[PDB]
Amino acid sequence: TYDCQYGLIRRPIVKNTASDEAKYESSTNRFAIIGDAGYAAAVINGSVYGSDASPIAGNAAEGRDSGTMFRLSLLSAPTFPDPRTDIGSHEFDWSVVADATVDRALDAAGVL
Amino acid sequence: FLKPEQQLERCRRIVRQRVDPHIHPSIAQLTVESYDIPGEPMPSDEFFAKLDRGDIDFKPFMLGSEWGTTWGTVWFRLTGTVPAGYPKGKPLELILDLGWYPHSCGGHIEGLVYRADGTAIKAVHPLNYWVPFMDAEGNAQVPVAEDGSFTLYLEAASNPLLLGVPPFIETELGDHATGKPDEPYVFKSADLAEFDERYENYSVDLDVVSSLMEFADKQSPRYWQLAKALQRSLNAYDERNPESVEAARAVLAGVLAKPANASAMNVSAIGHAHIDSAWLWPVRETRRKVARTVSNALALMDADPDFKYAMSSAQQYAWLEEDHPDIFKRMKRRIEEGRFIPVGGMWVEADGMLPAGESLIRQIAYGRKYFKEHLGVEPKGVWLPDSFGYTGAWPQIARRAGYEWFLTQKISWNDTTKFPHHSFMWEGIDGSRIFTHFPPADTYAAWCKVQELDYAEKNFQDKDLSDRSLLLFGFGDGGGGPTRNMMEHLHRYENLEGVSKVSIEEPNDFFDKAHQQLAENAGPEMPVWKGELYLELHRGTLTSQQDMKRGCRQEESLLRTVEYLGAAAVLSDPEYVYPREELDRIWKTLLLNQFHDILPGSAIAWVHREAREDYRRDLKRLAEIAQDMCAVLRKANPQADLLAEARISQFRNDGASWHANRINEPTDALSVLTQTLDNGRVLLANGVLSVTIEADGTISSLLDEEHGRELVPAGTRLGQYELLRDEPAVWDAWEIERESLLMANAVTGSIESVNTENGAAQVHVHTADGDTVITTTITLRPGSHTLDFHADIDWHERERFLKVDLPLGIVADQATYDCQYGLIRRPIVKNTASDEAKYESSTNRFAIIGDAGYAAAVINGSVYGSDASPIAGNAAEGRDSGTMFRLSLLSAPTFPDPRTDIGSHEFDWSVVADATVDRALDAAGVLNAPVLHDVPDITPLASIESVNGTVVLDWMKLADDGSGDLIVRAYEAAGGQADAMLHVCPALAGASVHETNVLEGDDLAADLPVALQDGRQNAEGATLHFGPFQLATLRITR
Amino acid sequence: DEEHGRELVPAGTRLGQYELLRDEPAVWDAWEIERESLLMANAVTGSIESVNTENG
Amino acid sequence: NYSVDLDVVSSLMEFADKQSPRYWQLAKALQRSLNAYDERNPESVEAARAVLAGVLAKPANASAMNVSAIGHAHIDSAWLWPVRETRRKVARTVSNALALMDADPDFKYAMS
Amino acid sequence: FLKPEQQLERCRRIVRQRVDPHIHPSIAQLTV
Ligand SMILES: [Zn+2]
Ligand SMILES: [Zn+2]
């Protein structure tokens, strides 16, 4: 569940078909929430917009349990229109909220 | 100057007229005598006993006459004599034509051949009607005298063709064999002939060359080289000179010795013959079909090395072992040397969606036990080629039983979408992965043609990561099997240009090699599909023959109680004996009734009549056994108080799961008020619900107190019946189609009476159509969050479909249905064409529809099919919004059963207002538990207490041996992580607990999680940790 | 997380780790990130320098 | 060598009968080779060449034609230029042929 | 999951821009 302009949007984490795999880099507006039936955690960001989510499959014969790999896009270095793009100093802020609901995520996103 | 099409036409004419006749040239004609059995068939043992003592007349028969009744049997005595000193270097086969319809197979007449001793030789089939008689050296199958005279027996089954070339035509020839010649067949041919292999080799060579020419890319050198070779070979063949057939063969040798392309696929071929347990014929014919198929396979093994054959169902093995011990002995000898492969390890090939999880586990357990104790083989894969979809809990059950791969080909029948993979990891709703392969040939019965190989090679969806696929070749769905011609073509296909590389291989080896190649090439990018395997076809199978689903669910719900009571009684009385053998028999009967054509309800009236009788008998017996166990428990527990009427419902809320509780228990809530409004409307109101019933018997307002929610959108009626026009173009019983929706007709009723029996408001409604009467009872109980509906229907329709509408007033994008061992989610909003294909899904005992902060559930008694759609509002009219959820009740198909479900039916369902997962589990469990009498309210044997999460203790039983240990099966229901505590009864003090697999074998895979950390412990106070849909299995030792 | 017992980081994974991808698209350089850029990740390693407590 | 290998693979992909295993094997090899090539590291050009080696070592089909190739350079005696330019063209062409013979064995050239 | 046309476009761009220049890299300039 990502934050929309005036609500929430939902995007697949498990990508079974080719249409799902096309949405491998979506937009997040000030926060995202990932939760099972009885527990959720949220990622809050300051001025980041791009992100992606993937599944982490476990293996009890190694100790890796399971989960979701969520990654935030910070910087890129393109070349064509601007030959020296984003060369210099940048500041970023984000946070992880442990026992998160919609309200708590709204609080964290608004305060930051 | 060279015209390839002319060469192809000339080749076809020459093969049909000048080459094929020289294969099997007749040298003698047999005398035929007949004996008719218009009724049920006589077993071969009894027939041969009577025959050797007399009692058989064998009236003379003349070739060209008609013999059979509708389902009767005819025994033919065939007498002959070989000419003087004839077998000069030829195998000397035997040709028997029974009047086969050419353009079909396995849907009509067949038969076996026997030696006067009473042992079978080989069956005769529409494309397989040769029987080995002697050899070139002169060794025969039957006693031949100095005169040269010999006799054989032929048991011919005369079965009607229920699938003509115009398909799906109504017929009355599908029950109670009558004894009249409804469609007689002529014999017309019985000869003794020699078998010239040179002409068959030339025929196969010509056929292969001509068929290769039809896919050989005109304007390529291969095409024109093949055309030139064909023309030269046809020129070189003279029918006047017999030996020239070899010279012509020397012309096609050049183009048939060219190796395969370096990028061609590697095809593994295994002989197969699917047999349906009961579909368009009774089971008593299925046994004969199995015997004939095994006879054909054994004969083919005798006639050809390098040929292997796979057989699947354990019930068919048991039938064959009981009926034909000699065939069983020969098959066992072939098995021991690795040429006859048993696959599957299940009792039958059951449906994937409808049966409960315990049904699947018991199928696996009984099949594996039979395979281990009767064949000495342990299968490593699940073999279910034909099934109308798979539940999604299959991967975990298969992984926790010891299987390593899965096989299926039904998903290729999809209406709309193409499944993205043929070789992949199928991952369940929990996380367990299994290796699944879909044969790209799109069939389980291939005829070994170049067309099939080419189609399979260009249909494969994993050309970038793998080059291995499995081919299943033979005749299927009614028996038959591979023939000699199929193997003679496959021998050519081994290394041939323009064709894949074919090799006869055991399926275990193929799966090992394919998985190794996929894992080596892919690495991180390995194909994975998570969820269920939904089939976009045959959506009407969830409603057809409602008695089947009714009986299946009722028998499972009663078996659970009976097994729990037996376990409780054994631990309470050392002098009580558990009825193991009778319960095994009942379980096996139920598992047989769970087959891919019986449970869906797509067979003839005979099969379903037999199944209904089985259900009635076994349900009565199980009720009696439960009463016996209750009497024993009462006699051994004088301290407990009796309960006049009570139910035992697994996962009852409020920490009282396996306790037995009354149907009507005292409550603090007052009696439910009733009131009649101005224009015949009724207003029911307990403390928590406010129901308004209009003059038409429909709920117009379901208001929830303490939340303010209106559960029925304005402008919609809850509880309204709809009639659809269901006249499909194909597969009448199987299919409900898109066009049937949008031709709905609402059926109107009226209120007749209002009553208050035990403080519960009860409203009676009658709805009519004309010979179709529905009586509905609407019930509201004191203090209950639920509203109940009961229905008695007299179905007398034809090609109509019945639904009931349940508007809910909640805007949701997806709906949560109950899976076998968890939950599944399906879209309500259908944006794309793939979504619209899932317009009729399955619900197992309940469904939940909820927004962020409010949910409502629909509970059903024995209904399986349902659909959900959005209701878009309009503030300029007053219609608010919501979800239209409809349950499928009855249908009236015509093709296999001309009078389907005509009669009386009972239905039960309920609506739960403020519903969560737990509350829905309670409602579903209580509505499905059976009702007993005089039940002591003893403390439960074992208990699961969830600190956090929702964990359901689904099953308790005794171990499948004489140990006396208690087997417990539990799973996580909510879908998140759960922590739980284990408690036991006072009898189980000092008992140990440890984890096993679903078959109690104590050996479990290292990849799978355990959920019982620290291992063997004490049963009282054990700590459990479930992941999402974990499905733990525990063994408790006294 | 206390009072729930949940471990929010799966075993075998590191939270807060930086990844560098090779982004050399064929078309629309500034506009595009492509599939092949993923699966060419290189983790970047650091070290701890100081621990402080300013306002608790 | 890498340029010629890439050109051959890509051009083979344009006539390789989509829906055939050869087409998809060539596509996978091309993708892997392009992933393996880093311009920052000069030596990686060899590693990429090791990915296209598998699909370029497959033998020809048994029904393929046998083509005999001979080097040729047609020269018109006088067409769009005077003969005095044709003499210089002949000298230049023979120079090119001799240089190519010096730079490569197994090469032959025909002149008329 | 694999798009051959994208691979062909990417190959053309890489050959034109990142591989061909490294053939014959200039080391000196001539006076004319
Ligand atoms: Zn079938
Ligand atoms: Zn010219």
TrEMBL record, chain D:
Coiled coil stretches, renumbered: none
Binding site residues for Zn(2+) 2: H74, D76
Chain sites annotated for binding Zn(2+) 1: H74, D76
Family statement drawn from the similarity comment of this UniProt entry: Belongs to the glycosyl hydrolase 38 family.
Protein name: Alpha-mannosidase
Full-protein positions shown: 202 to 313 of 1039
